[PDB]
Design a protein around this ligand. Structure first.
Ligand SMILES: [Mg+2]
Ligand SMILES: [Mg+2]
Ligand SMILES: [Mg+2]
Ligand SMILES: [Mg+2]
Ligand SMILES: [Mg+2]
Ligand SMILES: [Mg+2]
Ligand SMILES: [Mg+2]
Ligand SMILES: [Mg+2]
Ligand SMILES: [Mg+2]
Ligand SMILES: [Mg+2]
Ligand SMILES: [Mg+2]
Ligand SMILES: [Mg+2]
Lengths: 154, 143, 110, 99, 136
RNA sequence: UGUACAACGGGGUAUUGUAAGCAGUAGAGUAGCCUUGUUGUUACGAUCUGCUGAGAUUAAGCCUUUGUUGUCUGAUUUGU
RNA sequence: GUGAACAGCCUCUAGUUGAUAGAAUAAUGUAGAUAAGGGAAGUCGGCAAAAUAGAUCCGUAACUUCGGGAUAAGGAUUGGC
């Protein structure tokens, strides 16, 4: 029993989910879902479709190369059996996932660094234009004060 | 789907794949094997006048000449440019077999890339030399 | 107490027009708005503003909005008040968006 | 064939294939591999010296942490040399304008 | 009755009715095979006999060598193109319908099979497995 | 007459495929001007990039709710 | 306006908004549609539907009353700036 990766769309494939196409070279393409599979059949580009991990890595929205990503390989030469080694692997998996999520959040917080300065600049330009729309606001606030206070006077 | 994509992309109407055509365009011996085809009764130009990028057979040689001038061929040539998107790209995008994919990428930018480009250059000048003073009618004689 | 009252509501027409024929989607929304006002104010007599009718029919017969913000106000009738001394009057409030808004009571200063 | 005869028939006797493993311990012959943990395969991570690799990873991680770009607390706002009160005022006024 | 097949065959989705053209996947000299009967099929009013991957059929040769034509021969279906289910759970399909020429005892007439072979066919027929280099 | 019921609102779960707006040493080239230029400026220019897996939709027979606002009527008949 | 076009499709001037209505969404109909793998195995009979289709360029057989057949057959294309 194995979890596979979607060929077109890079999502996990669990047992009983999706479809597989066997090409004439014994190359097997497993598909996440009918959306990823039909995009394959219509021959669309996965590096061009924006909702895929291939696009996100190639465009630099996600971190692509890291020491935490050098751990899951296809292991073709097996080791015998060792209860202690299995327990160490099961601990190291959780530690590795924790480190990887921390580094991914750090990558996002670095690439989203200018979204306070840009917002202040557009807000100050909008406020610096249209002065007489700010006098309607000044009249509206003073009308909200006096009408409520004489209603609170009652 | 509806009707159009069902009519075109049906499994018994499937066309060849980009990474297979990329491995065809590498290895100059494979280019000579694809240019010097035998006679075949079920191919349009008796197995001759074959475009390697757009993996289709032409009727005449003047048909191949106008196809090479056209705009569908330029779309396929622009598609067959960089790293050809195998399953290794999907695996490494998921975070798996990443060192193997990195070896593959540096290998294709070191060795197989300029070889493919030099074969494609030689093939373009050879086809432009051959398809120059060709008549429009064809001798049906298959020798 | 005080059976004369005004409130602002938002009605979700998208889940009330699900499956309806295209030539009848805008005539059905008028009936659903009257049913909504009858359920919320208890009144059988409901009157719609023509500006609310314009807001309903603004995109043709099959292009009704998903959400609408309404102002409903219970009032009193006049001479020959048929069988009902109260009636509801429904108006539109043209807001920026109709999403993310709760029911509010309108303080009347008139 | 004899054990199969005295433990049922031919299509009845169920053979233990783990009964001839060559392991270091003999309480280990009837264990099972975990095979899946969260969304990952255990066979993808199972290798010797994974303890050494995780040691190198955590050493690099604490070195990176003491240089410190894990500073989530990062307030170096130099907006236009404004102060936060009139910054808040400009924000609420521009929100009013676009509404 | 079921001659040459080692063991039993479980249920697989049938793809090829009587009257279908499939490819010939060995080097015996044929190009396509026209399916005229299916060995070991049930009887029902109005229902066509249909073959799936790993079945012995009776076929004729339409295109190919001039000696092979105008005679009826046994064949075995090795690629299906209609999606069936593996019991380790995935649905899967090939690119084309394809089979090889055989005698009634299950032995093969050619010497090698081109392209992949379904593992159910290769597990059901031992002489198919000995002549194929790619099994799915 | 109370984790009572409903209308909205929130949170999940799902579908699509990157909103409007603003910006740019991005952009085949063509014009205008200074000192015809070891990216000369400007003006147009399909398209591209960033803010942005964004925006929209989500029960109408999806799941869940420490929120807001309201309501909790009335008719008919039956006896050994 | 599009377009070869008094074709079809959308709009201005002018004119109409008439034809019993309301609520639901069972079966069977009438008028339309889509369908994996196969491709006439269906039927008296490819009935019906699908497929083709404008324009540019290349190319086009038997036969013939030499005028035709002929858009024979077959192929490469088409946006925006
Ligand atoms: Mg319906
Ligand atoms: Mg909700
Ligand atoms: Mg945008
Ligand atoms: Mg984006
Ligand atoms: Mg014109
Ligand atoms: Mg016209
Ligand atoms: Mg079909
Ligand atoms: Mg027939
Ligand atoms: Mg018949
Ligand atoms: Mg019959
Ligand atoms: Mg017909
Ligand atoms: Mg004719």
């Amino acid at each position: 029993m194995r979890i596979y990766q979607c060929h077109f769309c890079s999502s996990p494939c669990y047992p009983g989910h999706g479809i597989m196409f066997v090409r004439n070279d014994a190359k097997e393409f497993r598909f996440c879902r009918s959306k990823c599979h039909k995009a394959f059949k219509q021959r669309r580009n996965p590096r061009k479709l924006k909702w895929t991990k291939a696009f996100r890595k190639a465009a630099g929205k996600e971190l692509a190369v890291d020491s935490t990503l050098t751990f899951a390989q296809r292991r073709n030469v097996p080791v015998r059996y060792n209860r202690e080694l299995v327990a160490t692997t099961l601990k190291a998996m959780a530690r590795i996932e924790e480190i990887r999520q921390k580094r991914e959040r750090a990558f996002y917080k670095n690439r989203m660094r200018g979204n306070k300065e840009k917002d202040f600049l557009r807000d100050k330009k909008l406020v610096e234009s249209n002065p007489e729309l700010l006098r309607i606001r000044e009249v509206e606030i003073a009308r909200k004060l006096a009408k409520e206070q004489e209603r609170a006077e009652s | 789907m509806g009707r159009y994509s069902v009519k075109r992309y049906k499994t018994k109407r499937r066309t060849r794949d980009l990474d297979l055509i990329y491995n065809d365009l590498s290895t100059k011996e494979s280019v000579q094997k694809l240019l010097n085809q035998p006679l075949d009764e079920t191919k349009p130009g008796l197995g001759q006048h074959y475009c390697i990028h757009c993996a289709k057979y032409m009727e005449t040689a003047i048909a191949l000449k106008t196809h090479l001038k056209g705009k569908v061929h330029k779309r396929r040539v622009k598609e067959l440019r960089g790293v050809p998107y195998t399953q290794e790209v999907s695996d490494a995008a998921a975070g798996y077999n990443l060192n193997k994919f990195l070896n593959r990428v540096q290998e294709i930018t070191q060795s197989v890339g300029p070889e493919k480009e030099s074969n494609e250059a030689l093939l373009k000048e050879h086809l432009d030399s051959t398809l120059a003073n060709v008549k429009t009618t064809e001798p049906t004689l298959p020798w | 107490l005080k059976d004369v009252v005004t409130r602002e509501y938002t009605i979700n027409l998208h889940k009330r027009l699900h499956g309806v024929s295209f030539k009848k989607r805008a005539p059905r929304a008028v009936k659903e708005i009257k049913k909504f006002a009858k359920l919320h104010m208890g009144t059988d007599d409901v009157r719609l503003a023509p500006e609310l009718n314009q807001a309903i029919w603004k995109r043709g017969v099959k292009g009704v909005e998903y959400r609408l913000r309404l102002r409903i106000s219970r009032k009193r009738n006049e001479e020959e008040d048929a069988k009902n001394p109260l009636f509801s009057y429904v108006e539109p409030v043209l807001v920026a968006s109709a999403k993310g808004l709760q029911t509010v009571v309108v303080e009347e200063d008139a | 064939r004899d054990i199969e005869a005295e433990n049922g028939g031919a299509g009845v006797f169920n053979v233990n294939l783990k009964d001839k493993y060559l392991l270091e311990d003999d309480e280990w012959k009837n264990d099972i591999m975990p095979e899946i943990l969260d969304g990952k395969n255990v066979y993808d991570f199972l290798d010797p010296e994974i303890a050494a690799k995780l040691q190198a990873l955590e050493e690099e991680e604490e070195k990176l942490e003491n240089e410190g770009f894990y500073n989530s607390d990062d307030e170096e706002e130099i907006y236009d040399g404004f102060e936060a009160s009139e910054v808040d005022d400009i924000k609420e006024k521009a929100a009013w304008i676009r509404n | 009755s079921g001659n040459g097949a080692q063991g039993t065959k479980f249920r697989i989705s049938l793809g090829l009715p009587v009257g279908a053209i499939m490819n010939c996947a060995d080097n015996s000299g044929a190009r396509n095979l026209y399916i005229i009967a299916v060995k070991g099929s049930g009887s029902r009013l109005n229902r066509l006999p249909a073959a799936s991957l790993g079945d012995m059929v009776m076929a004729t040769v339409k295109k190919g060598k001039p000696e092979l034509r105008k005679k009826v021969m046994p064949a075995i279906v090795v690629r299906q193109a209609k999606s069936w289910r593996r019991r380790d759970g995935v649905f899967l399909y090939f690119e084309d319908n394809a089979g090889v020429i055989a005698n009634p005892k299950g032995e093969m007439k050619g010497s090698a099979i081109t392209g992949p072979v379904g593992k159910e066919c290769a597990d059901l027929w031992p002489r198919v497995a000995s002549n194929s280099g790619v099994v799915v």
